[PDB]
Amino acid sequence: SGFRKMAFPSGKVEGCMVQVTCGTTTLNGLWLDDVVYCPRHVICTSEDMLNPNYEDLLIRKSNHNFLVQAGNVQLRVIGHSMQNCVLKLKVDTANPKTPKYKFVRIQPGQTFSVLACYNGSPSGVYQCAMRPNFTIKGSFLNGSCGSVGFNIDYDCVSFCYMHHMELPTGVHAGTDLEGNFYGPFVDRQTAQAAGTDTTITVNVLAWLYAAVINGDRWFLNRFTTTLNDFNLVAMKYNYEPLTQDHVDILGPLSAQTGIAVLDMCASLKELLQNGMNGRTILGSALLEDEFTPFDVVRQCSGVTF
Amino acid sequence: SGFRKMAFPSGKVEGCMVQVTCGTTTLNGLWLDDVVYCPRHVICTSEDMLNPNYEDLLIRKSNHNFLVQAGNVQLRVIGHSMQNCVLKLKVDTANPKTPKYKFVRIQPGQTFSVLACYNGSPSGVYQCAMRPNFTIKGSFLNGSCGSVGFNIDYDCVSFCYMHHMELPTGVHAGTDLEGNFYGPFVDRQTAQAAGTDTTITVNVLAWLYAAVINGDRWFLNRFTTTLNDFNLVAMKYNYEPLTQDHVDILGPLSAQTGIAVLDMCASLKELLQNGMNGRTILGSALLEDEFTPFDVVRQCSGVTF
Ligand SMILES: *[C@@H](C(=O)N(c1ccc(C(C)(C)C)cc1)[C@@H](C(=O)NC1CCCCC1)c1cccnc1)[C@@H](C)O
Numbered sequence: 001s002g003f004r005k006m007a008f009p010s011g012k013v014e015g016c017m018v019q020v021t022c023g024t025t026t027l028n029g030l031w032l033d034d035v036v037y038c039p040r041h042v043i044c045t046s047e048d049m050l051n052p053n054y055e056d057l058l059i060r061k062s063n064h065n066f067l068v069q070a071g072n073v074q075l076r077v078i079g080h081s082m083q084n085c086v087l088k089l090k091v092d093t094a095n096p097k098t099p100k101y102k103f104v105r106i107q108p109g110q111t112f113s114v115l116a117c118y119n120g121s122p123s124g125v126y127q128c129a130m131r132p133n134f135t136i137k138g139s140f141l142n143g144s145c146g147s148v149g150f151n152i153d154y155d156c157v158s159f160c161y162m163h164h165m166e167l168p169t170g171v172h173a174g175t176d177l178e179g180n181f182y183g184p185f186v187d188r189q190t191a192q193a194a195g196t197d198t199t200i201t202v203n204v205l206a207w208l209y210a211a212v213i214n215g216d217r218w219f220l221n222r223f224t225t226t227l228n229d230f231n232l233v234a235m236k237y238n239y240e241p242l243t244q245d246h247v248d249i250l251g252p253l254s255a256q257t258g259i260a261v262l263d264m265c266a267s268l269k270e271l272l273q274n275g276m277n278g279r280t281i282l283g284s285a286l287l288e289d290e291f292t293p294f295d296v297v298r299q300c301s302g303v304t305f
Numbered sequence: 306s307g308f309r310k311m312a313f314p315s316g317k318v319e320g321c322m323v324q325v326t327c328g329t330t331t332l333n334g335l336w337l338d339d340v341v342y343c344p345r346h347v348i349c350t351s352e353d354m355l356n357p358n359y360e361d362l363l364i365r366k367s368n369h370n371f372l373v374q375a376g377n378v379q380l381r382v383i384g385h386s387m388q389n390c391v392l393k394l395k396v397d398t399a400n401p402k403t404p405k406y407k408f409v410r411i412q413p414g415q416t417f418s419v420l421a422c423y424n425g426s427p428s429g430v431y432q433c434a435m436r437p438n439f440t441i442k443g444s445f446l447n448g449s450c451g452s453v454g455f456n457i458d459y460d461c462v463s464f465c466y467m468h469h470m471e472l473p474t475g476v477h478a479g480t481d482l483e484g485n486f487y488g489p490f491v492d493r494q495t496a497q498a499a500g501t502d503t504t505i506t507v508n509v510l511a512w513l514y515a516a517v518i519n520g521d522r523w524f525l526n527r528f529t530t531t532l533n534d535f536n537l538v539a540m541k542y543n544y545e546p547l548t549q550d551h552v553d554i555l556g557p558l559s560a561q562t563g564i565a566v567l568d569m570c571a572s573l574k575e576l577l578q579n580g581m582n583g584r585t586i587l588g589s590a591l592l593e594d595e596f597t598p599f600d601v602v603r604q605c606s607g608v609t610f
């Protein structure tokens with residue numbers, strides 16, 4: 001019993017973290033096979049940060065200008081290239097600790113684990129969701145750039161996020177491992193604002209099923225609703241519209257609990273309109289939306305890796 | 306910026322997890338040097354669970370009755386003994402992945418990371434606090450027994466918790482790595498209740514300092530208070546009494562923010578008496594008490610391992 005924000009075990013990713021230095025900037029890199037991946041702004045200096053011409057800045061850089069260290073060992077850089085917003089440094093040694101891995105671009109609403117790193121060394125691990133506005137609400141200090149986010153399926157690591165920057169509002173922006181930002185963000189020191197941060201409805205519903213599985217049942221009401229009627233309510237509370245695809249994804253949890261999804265929608269509707277009245281659900285006083293239906297099933301069924 | 310419940314990187318502990326089978330019970334073990342540590346109730350059968358005589362049950366067990374597997378390899382058991390509520394199985398191979406480690410018995414209010422495991426394989430990692438009543442509010446399913454909790458100081462793993470059991474109320478109880486339970490709990494299927502679950506005051510204060518560091522300042526009031534006056538308030542809300550030792554431990558955060566501890570106590574006092582009025586602090590609608598002052602400093606200063 002119990003329900004916690006649970007990260008994947010990070011050992012397979014720890015063995016891939018390296019330090020990358022160029023000129024006077026150091027940040028984190030990801031060493032898989034004979035390639036090191038890192039944010040391209042490692043090549044920026046203080047005066048280039050407002051509007052850097054990255055292709056021009058790279059003309060000034062040769063292989064030996066990139067210092068890559070794994071522990072106290074340095075890998076010899078034998079090629080370099082830019083792919084969107086990431087640099088790819090070819091080294092002459094394949095990482096012996098390379099796990100089975102894939103690169104994936106995740107959808108808004110999906111979750112992942114972050115291994116926060118400084119100077120190529122791990123500091124901690126925590127679970128994040130890609131917000132609907134393509135930010136993440138992480139915990140990142142200066143020097144954390146190049147830390148990665150990932151999911152694990154048994155023995156295969158799916159890398160989905162590389163951290164690039166903090167926005168002035170204190171939320172976080174980054175890329176997939178092909179260097180394409182999530183959202184409209186650019187890697188420069190300019191005024192960037194995130195759009196409206198809406199709530200991931202299908203995740204809230206999944207967490208309510210988690211609560212029922214754990215015996216927290218006070219919020220189960222005596223109504224049902226329809227998709228269109230629920231969505232009129234969700235729109236006023238800046239919740240994402242619920243679709244039949246979402247209902248189908250909640251199928252496993254509905255079957256386990258015997259609570260129809262539209263019945264659970266009616267309970268959420270009353271929670272939104274009446275609040276929680278000083279009560280809690282799974283130890284929280286607000287509706288939690290950073291657990292996916294898969295996250296709930298994994299945690300309530302003991303899936304291992 | 307940002308503040309998250311952050312676990313230690315788990316790689317050093319992942320390499321120590323094994324599966325232990327005795328008769329028909331399987332659970333998790335911790336393999337360090339040539340010893341495997343696990344809960345002694347691995348030797349119980351269905352009929353012994355209400356009141357097992359563990360010393361009598363061990364008479365019936367020889368070395369070859371203990372099956373210990375690390376991945377697909379089995380370690381040969383060459384001795385066994387009981388230390389309080391843990392079994393110590395001597396194997397003929399030292400774990401090549403043994404980290405620098407220590408065993409520690411933590412105090413109530415201190416935090417640690419849990420690597421939840423099933424069948425010797427890691428499922429996830431999350432941060433826990435030892436409650437004042439010596440329970441933990443974990444996420445553990447059947448078969449998680451023998452999962453361990455730990456802290457890391459640079460390169461040294463301090464193991465502090467081995468999971469043994471769930472209470473009927475759904476909270477969790479376990480031992481230090483010398484097999485001594487935290488709290489009054491016993492490893493048998495009998496009615497055990499936890500005592501009153503009080504709030505860790507020094508941790509709430511640390512988290513309020515974390516909030517100020519992150520710019521969440523709305524709760525900073527215009528009063529101060531005294532230790533004795535604050536403690537009259539904390540007693541009514543089942544908060545732990547604040548001591549001068551606690552004030553001193555908050556010294557680093559007080560110095561960083563310029564907010565005297567007793568001023569922060571006055572802000573907490575008003576939060577307790579008036580509630581949060583539908584506002585949030587670091588994304589939470591309730592006062593969080595599972596971050597220690599050290600946890601806040603680590604997360605707000607980027608300490609690595
Ligand atoms: C990476 C780093 O940690 N940070 C960073 C990232 C990108 C840049 C640009 C402007 C692309 C060269 C500079 C610095 C910082 C960060 O994002 N700071 C922002 C503050 C607001 C204005 C724009 C820059 C960072 C700080 C905290 C969390 N994540 C990232 C650097 C060490 O290479």
Ligand SMILES: *[C@@H](C(=O)N(c1ccc(C(C)(C)C)cc1)[C@@H](C(=O)NC1CCCCC1)c1cccnc1)[C@@H](C)O
Binds near residue numbers: 330447469493
């Ligand atoms: C360990 C296991 O997972 N659990 C367990 C622990 C201890 C025992 C005794 C009675 C000491 C032999 C039995 C089972 C369960 C667990 O604690 N169940 C309790 C339910 C309430 C009555 C007492 C037993 C467990 C379940 C969920 C989370 N943690 C532990 C077993 C697989 O060896």
